[PDB]
């Protein structure tokens, strides 16, 4: 049905990625990968 | 049905990406990849 | 049905991307990739 | 049905990733990978 | 049915990952990998 | 006086291929009958 | 006086291919009968 | 006077392949009949 | 005067392959009939 | 004057393969009929 | 529909030859540095 | 549909030859540094 | 549909030869440094 | 559909040969440094 | 569908040969440093 | 020095000759080939 | 020094000759081949 | 020194010769092959 | 020194010869092969 | 020194010869092979 999301604070740095066959996520809320 | 999202603060830096066969995400809310 | 999204603040920097066969996203809300 | 998520604070740094055949996540809430 | 998650604070650093055939997660709440 | 070779090339030939595909969703990567070297 | 070679090229030939595709969604990458080297 | 070789190339040939696919969801990587070397 | 070789290449040939796939969910990696070397 | 070889390559051939797959969930890794060397 | 080949021909190349002859009597046949196929 | 080959030909190459001959009497046949196939 | 081959041909190459001959009487046949196949 | 081969051919290569001959009388047959197959 | 082979051919290579001959009388047959198969 | 030859009677027939690297002779008297 | 030859009678027939690396002779008197 | 040869009668027939690396002779008198 | 040869009568037939590395002779008188 | 040879009568037939590395002779008188 749905999402209620708030007041999230994120900082990030990503170094080299070869092959992302999937999920590289800071915060993942109910997603499908 | 739906999303209610707010007051999110994000800063990010991404280094080299080779092949992104997927999701590289700061915050992912209910998405499909 | 729908989205209600607000007061989001984002800053980002992306370095070289080879092949983006997917999603490179700061914030993704309910999208399909 | 759904998610109620809030006041989350995240900082992260990722070093080189070879092949992400899966999930590399700071916080994962109810997602499917 | 759903998730109620809040006031989480996370900091992390990831070194090189070869092949992530699975889950490398700081906090995982009810996800499926 | 010496011989130096890099023969890192390739050859493909006598092949018979039938490739049939039904509905495809996001094709994030590849569906390949036969792949000979290369990078997706 | 010496010979130097880089033969990193390619050859493809006697082939018979039938490729049939049904509905395709976003094709983010490739659907290839036969791929010989190269980069998608 | 010496011979030096790097023959890290490849050859593929007498093959008969039938590849049939039904509905595919996100193809994050690859579905390959035959893969000969290479990188997905 | 000496011979030096790196023959780290490859050959594939007399093959008969039938590959049939039913519904596929996220293909995070690969479904391969035959894989000969390479990296997914 | 000496001979030096690295033959860490490969050969695959007379094969007959039938590969059939039913519904696949997240394929985190691989389903392979035959894998000859390589890395998933 | 079929391929038919007779490749009974020839190739000769990177060669360095020094040929010196002193008095020759009846040369009934041949004095050859290098002979590649053929008939005397 | 079938492949038919007769490759009864030949190749000769990286060679260094020094051939020196002193007085020769009737040469009934041959004096050859190197003979590769053929008929005298 | 079948493959048929007669590869009864030949290859010769990295060679270094020094051939020196002193007085030769009737050469009824042959004096050969190296003979590779063939008929005298 | 079947493979048929006659590979009754030959290969010769990395060789270093020094051949020196003193007076030769009737050479009824052959004096050969190295003979690889063939008929005198 | 079956494989049939006659590989009755030959290979010769890394060799170092010094052949020196003094006076030869009728050479009815052969003087050979190295003989690999064949018929005199 | 010399030859004294007489009253010789010869009849001959020769079939195909491939390569005559030598002597094919009915009567040879003191010759050099 | 020499030859004294006489009253010789010869008839001959030769079939195919491949390679005559030598002497094929009816009568050979003191010759060199 | 020499030869004194006489009243010789010869008839011959030769079939196929492959390689004559030598002497095929009806009568050979003091020759060198 | 020499030869004195006479009143010789010869008839012969030769079948196929492969390689004559030597002497095939009806009558050989003092020859060298 | 020499030969005195006479009144010799010879008839012969030779079948296939493979490799004559030697002497095949009807009558051999003082020869060298």
Author numbering:
A (entry chain K), B (entry chain O), C (entry chain S), D (entry chain G), E (entry chain C), P (entry chain Q), ...: 8 to 40
F (entry chain P), G (entry chain T), H (entry chain L), I (entry chain H), J (entry chain D), K (entry chain R), ...: 1 to 40
Kindly provide excerpts from the paper associated with this entry.
Adult individuals with Down syndrome (DS) develop Alzheimer disease (AD). Here we report the structure of Aβ and tau filaments from two DS brains. We found two Aβ40 filaments (types IIIa and IIIb) that differ from those previously reported in sporadic AD and two types of Aβ42 filaments (I and II) identical to those found in sporadic and familial AD. Tau filaments (paired helical filaments and straight filaments) were identical to those in AD, supporting the notion of a common mechanism through which amyloids trigger aggregation of tau.
Type IIIb Aβ40 filaments have a width of 12–16 nm and are composed of four protofilaments organized as a dimer of dimers (interface 2), with each dimer similar to the type IIIa Aβ40 filaments. In the two inner protomers of type IIIb Aβ40 filaments, the density at the N-terminal region was resolved due to inter-protofilament interactions, allowing us to model residues Asp1 to Val40. The outermost protomers of type IIIb Aβ40 filaments are composed of five β-strands while the inner protomers are composed of four β-strands. At interface 2 of the type IIIb Aβ40 filaments, the two dimers interact through their extended N-terminal region through a hydrogen bond between Glu3 and His14. In type IIIb Aβ40 filaments, the extra density around His14–Lys16 coincides with the interaction site between the two innermost protomers of type IIIb Aβ40 filaments. This extra density, probably a charged host factor, interacts with both the disordered Asp1 and Lys16. Type IIIa Aβ40 filaments (~3.5 Å resolution) and type IIIb Aβ40 filaments (~3.8 Å resolution) represented ~15% of the Aβ filaments. We were unable to observe the three fibril structures reported by Kollmer et al. but rather determined two structures composed of Aβ40 filaments formed by Aβ peptides ending at position Val40, types IIIa and IIIb Aβ40 filaments, which were reconstructed at 3.5 and 3.8 Å resolution, respectively.
